[PDB]
């Protein structure tokens, strides 16, 4: 009576070893470890998992297979993998890991990741030699694999015994090594009758090991899921050879937790209709999970639905037929790697969303406080706020989401806005709810992002923050112009030009960073300012959101709340992030020039004086130095010390990215290398004699991103017209590039001339979208590039795309050209036969074959 | 009328390429910038001097040419290496740099050098386009070479033109580029007789330029200073070539610079008397100078003195004839490169001794306070402090300076030592001085190290910091132990091994730090007390101090004062160094334990009761788990949160060396790559079977060091016998290393048989020379490593030297080994021949040849 398991390990044994190499791998789910690797090779300290078993132990926990609470036992720690992991999970209050050490074993690595203070990782530590300690959840991830196993057998009934006595009423979850062997199946089944649980295998473990986990959530037939198992990876033997699926790596964070500043308190005075409606609404499925892993945003319910999402992206094939070579670049292909499933969205949320910013010093209050009064009145000097309309709201919707054509087309959605307005001029706030992903849901969402346009749209259909009314904005000045700014900017002296990225900005507004941009109602008509009151008092301070979240027994959504932070997904949130910005650069620059102090941000009764005599004879000049876009700035302060003014910067909550929060800030002075909107910007001389300031990135990403469809039913003629809209975007904006001008020419030729570009190559604010037309592509690049452009004097036009320049050959290979390779001059060789190839797909329309 | 400086330039255009790079180096003096660029290259913002332009003004303010002070402008800053130099000077408060930067111009490059906060670096700004600002230093460096002179020199009057309306009675320091060109000696003289100051050649300047620098504080003859200069660079033309004299770079430190919190407020009834004396004894050439350079140390005068030092130590001839291939490796010559010269010592005061301290948190003082007074009961549980006296003083400097046995065999020494001692009793302290390089002289300091002795040497002569006694200490162990009490150690359960540095400990020791050091006198004698507190609160906590200083004419001698800092000329030093070190890390134990958190450093009224429990519950244990030596620290935490406790290590002054304050320890698990007491240690199997645990370090380390003599007047037999001495010591120490047991044998081999090795091959604490004999090495081998060695039970002898292991050949050449070169081959067949070399140097005498 030979098991199944046993079949297996015999002919797992008598592999090669290019075979065995190539089986363990078949189809299983890998996590990607390279950037941690060489993060960790440099001794970082953040973010950083320690090890791939982080990993490993968040796939149990995604699925409530165990939930570790209170004290965390973490039996063969290692490196620390599970322990890291646990120290940011919200009912865990201390990690203890007890792990071997020495030759031969793995050791405990020291780490700054969330929850870093609470984890206490000891070496040294024989398990088999220690007495079982109380505990509320008991890890174990120990087992040595044998050729032989009997061998196995033996380890595995050793580490069972001497795990059992740690457990009772608790959370577990323990790797059982060998679970094939019939007497450790038989040792498995009275485990299961007195502690409970059942054995389940993880998708990340290798082919070449039979290793299941017994975890404490669940029940179920232990014989029958081991021969699943067997008979999977037997399978899996003569199965046709699939690479890994492979996933992002966990980030972990950084900092110390206090578990008791974590919860929120909500106001349910103004949450409570929005709760009780969405409650009533689903009613039938509506109920209150004690398990939600919400730290730091307030749970109120539940209610099951329908799953939404993809683990990648649809591909647009049109234009990854007309760019083969780019099929084996990895950064290309890893850009279609997206995931929108419920699993991926809660681990976004955990590891970015679900944090909480210390607030501010009292002194640090009152500068903020200060400046933004100013600021208001600066950008206030010319301009009034005003209500938007109907009218206008309607206009816009026309003028680009079918579904929202028909409801502002329906009379009946405007009866539902008119009486949630009713309500907001009470004080009252019924169905307003933004989410993170009847018809009647439909029309509350987009009726509420309607009553934050009429409320605040002003700020960008105004054009409040363009450069002209704010000096640091950029506000409707297009990718083609930012370029320009920079090199303008280049020329103030003083110091380097900054570019810090903050780490994730939104989650870093803070309560006093939105009762500072709620000021700007204090310019308003009465009964407008009641109206926008309604908005920053009921919903931008008080947001109710949807989230999907997957559970055992199928998705659901969660209805949560928080006071601070930005609603990510709302009108207002550009022109706000880019007032909140210059303020923050504003006070940074006050630093770096010694006017304000570390005793003035902890002095919690600061002098207004010295800060109102800065900005009205230094302020202006100040915002000129800037140029900032939202979250995005560049700074050119009077010297460099600003570099290392970063007090008041933390301690305004905006910490910057993937540098230790204390190390000084570094600049460039070559205005072409610094990073604004995803860009950096060159300067070409045309052979005219003229120069152009151009907008680039890495190659790959524009590559990539190309290769990307939109809608969940692409119809060839759909996609195509998408795959001529980046090519026009290509010639107007990335022309300089020679193997996109050269790739933009294929898909021209390749697609019907008549054909009108569909769609949109992209969301972005600066994209004014000038290639999404039928006409000549030089016409449209000289109206852009000579006429309108302010920086070109000579409006000489140009008759020749022979004299429109391409970047240095060597600046092109420096940010990602494939110019030089083999591949890319093969490539260029069979264009003309994959036009044909492109052409045959779509039929038989009129084509105009292209350079 | 061709100048002599038009000759120099005409021979100069001539040279082919290679002879002009020989000749531009050509014995000038040149800063070592190898490590300095490779810390910019990791963007390092700390010590490293941002260009070679501080050490070259700094050529100039050494010699008081330029002393900046007040408002500096730097003209043509460049990269910032004047500005940053400037910013720590004494009477500096504020610098301005500005500098044109752009394509093929230096860009200023921000750092956090000490006094950052006072630099103002500006790029952009072309200073001929510039009007002229008010300021008490004007520095310019600006000049372009020209292979044409008279380009050149209307590049140098375009200069001087410029700079000239920058001055008015202020201090300046201006380069000329071409200061021999006849219109530019004319344009200088008439300079020279409007604003003073004189032309100065700098020795860090390349022969390929004649500039100079015209500084404000001299007088002289420009047109014969130009010619001097003239005619040693023709010199150089002809001139045999010789290698550049390779200098130390400078250290910039780090952190704000508060200018109001530099100075040093003197205790004058405490110290006033001593200073009365000294200037009584040097009346005649005693005054005030106005210009010394003290920031942080009061000053007192100065009296004239002859010059101390040399540019670099002397070199053993019979080691470094054995040695030949080492004649060629850097850090091995790179050893002997020493300055003890008035200009090296004022280098080092400035870098490393002219700081000040931040007072610590009144939390932090609490719990220092707490454990000190814990630490000493600890301390005298067994032991009770005792007198030492005038017979142990002496008998002490017998068996070892030639004048210190003299002066102890003088009974007018003794009676003037009572005289003093009968001041200390009455508060008083008359003749109490250390310093930092009539017989009067000579007597007052060697009396004042015995009153020390007397009072504070029970801590030494009773060992109270043995491992018996201190549980953390190593006093008495020897170097032949300290690896295996770091092997016992490593076999404690819980976090790494760390090891950090404190960046100059003994300045780091706080006013806080000695009052604590002072409570061991609450366990004295009466009698011993009120002489102890004599010597702590007189002498320890008021130090007077002579240090030499440079000046244009002649050294001078400063007396100046400090409170707080550790004397580092004195009895207690390490024992002091030692108690403050194990109170330290106690400390930093707690608060990665949790114990000890951020509100409690900063509450004013820390609860005692948590600190005291932790100590009588775990104090003991948690002092087992380290070896402290001094200032030197090795620490096993129970887990590794210790790492990322930097809070109190930080606030009580101890900041670690070479890494960012803020950023985590880094430590060890293999117990034999942890370094302590400038050693490692590696367990060896000898073949017996039986295991040794060795010393060892950078093999260069060890060759260099023998490779200098003792004596300023080497006498072939003495610096023979310390040859011998350092052969001795390397087959008892490190005959585990091929190269020195080899070169050991050589040594031995090449002196007389019966020459009794002379002075010391060093003076650590841990050496026991037990080397220093005629004895068989064999047989002291054994009795080492084997009889008195308690963690080697069997105690067979050893008969036979090739029992004796080396280390593992790979690890032999990861620590610095030369095994494999084909030179090492050469040298070891070379070696009978080499001992005959030095067996004929020495003459006559009986050698025995060694293998
Ligand atoms: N007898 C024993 N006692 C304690 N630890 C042991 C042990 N036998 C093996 N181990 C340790 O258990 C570890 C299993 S690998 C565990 C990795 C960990 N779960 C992570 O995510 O990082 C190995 O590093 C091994 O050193
Ligand atoms: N016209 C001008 N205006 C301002 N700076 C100039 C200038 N002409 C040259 N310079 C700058 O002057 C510098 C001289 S080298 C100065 C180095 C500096 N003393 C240090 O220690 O680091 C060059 O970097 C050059 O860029
Ligand atoms: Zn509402
Ligand atoms: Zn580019
Ligand atoms: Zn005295
Ligand atoms: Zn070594």
């Excluded at 020495?102 to 398990?127: A, F, Q, R």
Aim: net charge positive; aromatic share 8%.
């Amino acid at each position: 009576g030979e098991t199944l398991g046993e079949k297996w390990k015999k002919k797992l044994n008598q592999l090669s070893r290019k075979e065995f190499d190539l089986y363990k791998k078949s189809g299983i789910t890998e996590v990607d470890r390279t950037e941690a690797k060489e993060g960790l090779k440099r001794g970082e300290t953040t973010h950083h998992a320690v090890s791939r078993g982080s990993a490993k132990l968040q796939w149990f926990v995604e699925r409530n297979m165990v939930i570790p609470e209170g004290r965390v036992i973490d039996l063969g720690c290692g490196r620390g993998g599970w322990s890291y992991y646990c120290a940011g999970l919200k009912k865990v209050t201390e990690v203890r890991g007890y792990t071997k050490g020495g030759p031969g074993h793995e050791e405990p690595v020291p780490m700054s990741t969330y929850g870093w203070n609470i984890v206490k990782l000891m070496s040294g530590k024989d398990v088999f030699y220690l007495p079982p300690e109380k505990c509320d959840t008991l890890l174990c991830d120990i087992g040595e694999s044998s050729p032989s196993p009997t061998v196995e057998e033996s380890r595995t009934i050793r580490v069972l015994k001497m795990v059992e006595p740690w457990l009772k009423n608790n959370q577990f979850c323990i790797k059982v090594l060998n679970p094939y062997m019939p007497t450790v199946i038989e040792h498995l089944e009275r485990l299961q009758r007195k502690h409970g649980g059942m054995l389940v295998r993880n998708p990340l473990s290798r082919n070449s090991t039979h290793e299941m986990y017994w975890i404490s959530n669940g029940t179920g037939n232990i014989v029958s899921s081991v021969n699943m198992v067997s008979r999977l990876l037997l399978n899996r033997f003569t199965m046709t050879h699939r690479r890994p699926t492979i996933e992002k790596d966990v980030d972990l964070g950084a900092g110390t937790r206090h578990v008791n500043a974590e919860p929120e308190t909500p106001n349910m005075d103004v949450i409570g209709e929005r709760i009780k409606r969405i409650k009533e609404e689903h009613n039938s499925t509506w109920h209150y999970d004690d398990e939600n892993p919400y730290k730091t945003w307030a749970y109120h319910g539940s209610y099951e639905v329908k799953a939404t999402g993809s683990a990648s992206s649809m591909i647009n094939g049109v234009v990854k037929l007309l760019t083969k070579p780019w099929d084996v670049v990895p950064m290309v292909t890893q850009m279609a790697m997206t995931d929108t499933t419920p699993f991926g969205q809660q681990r976004v949320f955990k590891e970015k969303v679900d944090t909480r910013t210390p607030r501010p010093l009292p002194g640090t209050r009152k500068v903020m406080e200060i400046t933004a009064e100013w600021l208001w009145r600066t950008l206030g000097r010319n301009k009034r706020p005003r209500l938007c309309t109907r009218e206008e709201f309607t206009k816009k919707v026309r003028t680009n989401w079918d579904s929202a054509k028909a409801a502002v087309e329906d009379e009946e959605f405007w009866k539902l806005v008119d009486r949630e307005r009713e309500l907001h001029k009470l004080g009252k706030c019924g169905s307003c709810v933004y989410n993170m992903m009847s018809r009647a849901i439909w029309y509350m969402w987009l009726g509420v992002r309607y009553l934050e346009f009429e409320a605040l749209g002003f700020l960008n259909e105004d054009h409040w923050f363009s450069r002209e009314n704010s000096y640091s904005g950029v506000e409707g000045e297009g990718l083609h112009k930012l370029g320009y700014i920079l090199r303008d900017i280049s020329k103030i002296p003083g110091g380097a030009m900054y570019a810090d990225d903050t780490a994730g900005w939104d989650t870093r507004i803070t309560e006093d960073d939105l009762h500072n941009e709620e000021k700007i109602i204090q310019q308003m008509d009465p009964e407008h300012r009641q109206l926008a009151n309604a908005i920053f008092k009921l919903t931008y301070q008080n947001k109710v959101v949807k989230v999907q979240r997957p559970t055992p027994t199928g998705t659901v959504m969660d209805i949560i709340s928080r006071k601070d932070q930005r609603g990510s997904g709302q009108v207002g949130t550009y022109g706000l992030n880019t007032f909140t910005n210059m303020e923050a650069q504003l006070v940074r620059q006050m630093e770096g020039e010694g006017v304000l102090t570390k005793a003035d941000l902890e002095n919690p009764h600061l002098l207004e004086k010295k800060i109102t005599q800065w900005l009205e004879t230094k302020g202006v000049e100040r915002l000129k130095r800037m140029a900032i876009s939202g979250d995005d700035c560049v700074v050119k302060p009077i010297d460099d010390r600003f570099a290392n003014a970063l007090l008041a910067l933390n301690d305004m909550g905006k910490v910057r990215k993937d540098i230790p929060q204390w190390q000084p800030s570094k600049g460039w002075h070559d205005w072409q290398q610094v990073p604004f909107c995803s860009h950096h910007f060159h300067e070409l001389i045309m052979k005219d004699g003229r120069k152009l300031v151009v907008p680039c990135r890495p190659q790959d990403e524009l590559i990539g991103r190309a290769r990307i469809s939109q809608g969940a039913g692409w119809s060839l003629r759909e996609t195509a017209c998408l795959g001529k809209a980046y090519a026009q975007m290509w010639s107007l904006m990335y022309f300089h590039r020679r193997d996109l001008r050269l790739a933009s020419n294929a898909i021209c030729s390749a697609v019907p001339v008549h054909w009108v570009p569909t769609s949109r190559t992209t969301w972005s604010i600066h994209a004014h979208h000038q290639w999404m037309t039928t006409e000549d592509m030089l016409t449209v690049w000289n109206r852009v590039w000579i006429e309108e452009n302010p920086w070109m004097e000579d409006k000489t036009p140009v008759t020749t795309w022979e004299n429109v320049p391409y970047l240095g050959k060597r600046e092109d290979q420096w940010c990602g050209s494939l110019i030089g390779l083999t591949s890319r001059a093969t490539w260029a060789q069979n264009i003309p036969t994959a036009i044909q190839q492109v052409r045959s797909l779509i039929g038989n329309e009129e084509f105009l074959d292209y350079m």
